[PDB]
Recover the amino acids of this structure.
């Protein structure tokens, strides 16, 4: 069971900080019990009410006012999940997630890892499926924004890992596709270098989905403008926090800013 | 297996009739061996060349110049399949199949049937899938235009059977959905009455797919204008001929007209 405690006032409660209040009301918390079963997940603030929701892994640092996410162990996660399952294909509906993030001591996080991946995912666009119930879910996110230890000798960069078709390539429903060209790592994904991650400094990310486009700005500069016509049928949603693709360590992300905005016109 | 012959000149060869040449060049023939096993199907004119393709089940009546499709037995078929796998969701791309059809003595065709369906399908909009290879095919056609013996005491009408979502509701990939509300017959399909089939007279059908609409005109009159936004990701295609959903008899359709036209602009 995941617990809540502000450690006698040491930890700030996220719902008490105006800069995070709106995104919190628009979301729920999906967090693993670090010492529970593999890949486990608990849900809180199902209604968007984060009042009282705080613990050692999810809090606001009272001095910096950063929203802090932590999690230990491979495949465990700690994320705010924005509730809207939005269409990505319409010209008059644009959905934006804006963040300023610093990943804390990621090389140390990964010291004892033997993962071949060695990534921390801190922003994501997932699909729900064809409908709000998750029918025909595709078990691949549209986007993962990650800190990656070593990508063919390029060390400590941020990357956007973009799923570049709508094909199921793993699991029970991917058996017919997994060995085809469309499921090869270099075909099913397009990767964008978002730059070397800086030390002791936050980096701004702005992700806009809509009008058949996935747009990513980094520190105010447009780096990704990717056509996602192929994803048109999939209702999609934002997550932010940490998700571990490395073993035997704890990740830690500090968000100086986390915002969500829907721009629906006409 | 399927053999070709004009019966010493008695049968007209479809490729020799100018009014059918264009649709044929744009299609292939998918036809069953009438004596073979349920569901069997053979393929001819893979390149659109129908020269020499004629037999007692697929011919032009030399007197009337009707293109004749016949087939006997349950779940056997005899259809031209138009090659283009088109998008249905774009405003500047519309795809039209136009036919004038007469179903010959269908009550006699079904005289010995024990099928609960008792339908002859003679026009169809199918999906290929997400791509030309058929990835993630949905095993349900978007549309079937049929002659139906009896639908809730309404006898001998034409119907448009329209699949009203993009959900797989049967087969190995439908197990998770098949018992849900979205797969119930009354939800998964919308049925339109296209009128009582006339005696000894052809009926015109014009099917237009594109711009997120499925339109059906019957003798010029717009009877179906259905929003197909839900099908947007599925590349789709036309078939025309006969497909039997009844047992122990022979279907026969006479097409005075069969045309295909793509209206692609910018
Ligand atoms: O397949 C990928 O692109 C990424 O999948 C991730 O696992 C998914 C998993 O398939 C489920 O959808 C689950 O709900 O979420 C996981 C996720 O991390 O979002 C990871 O395996 C990631 O490395 C893959 O690259």
């Amino acid at each position: 069971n995941v617990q809540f405690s502000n450690q006698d006032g040491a930890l700030g409660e996220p719902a008490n900080y105006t800069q995070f209040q709106h995104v919190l009301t628009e979301s729920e918390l999906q967090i693993s019990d670090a010492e529970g079963k593999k890949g486990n997940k608990e849900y809180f603030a199902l209604d968007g009410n984060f009042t009282g929701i705080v613990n050692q892994y999810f809090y606001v640092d009272k001095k910096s006012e950063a929203l802090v996410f932590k999690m230990k162990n491979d495949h465990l996660r700690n994320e705010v999940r924005v509730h809207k399952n939005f269409r990505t294909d319409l010209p008059n509906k644009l959905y934006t997630l804006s963040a300023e993030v610093e990943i804390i001591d990621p090389v140390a996080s990964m010291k004892n890892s033997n993962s071949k991946q060695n990534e921390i995912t801190f922003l994501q666009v997932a699909n729900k499926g064809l409908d709000n119930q998750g029918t025909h879910n595709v078990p691949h996110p549209l986007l993962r924004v990650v800190w990656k230890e070593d990508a063919n000798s390029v060390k400590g960069h941020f990357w956007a890992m973009v799923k570049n078709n709508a094909v199921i390539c793993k699991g029970s429903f991917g058996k017919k596709n997994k060995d085809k060209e469309m499921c090869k790592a270099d075909v099913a994904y397009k990767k964008y270098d978002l730059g070397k991650a800086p030390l002791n400094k936050a980096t701004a990310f702005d992700i806009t989905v809509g009008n058949k486009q996935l747009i990513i700005d980094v520190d105010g500069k447009r780096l990704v403008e990717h056509d996602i016509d192929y994803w048109r049928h999939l209702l999609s949603y934002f997550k932010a926090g940490v998700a571990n693709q490395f073993t035997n360590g704890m990740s830690e992300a500090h968000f100086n800013k986390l915002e969500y905005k829907a721009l629906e016109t006409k």
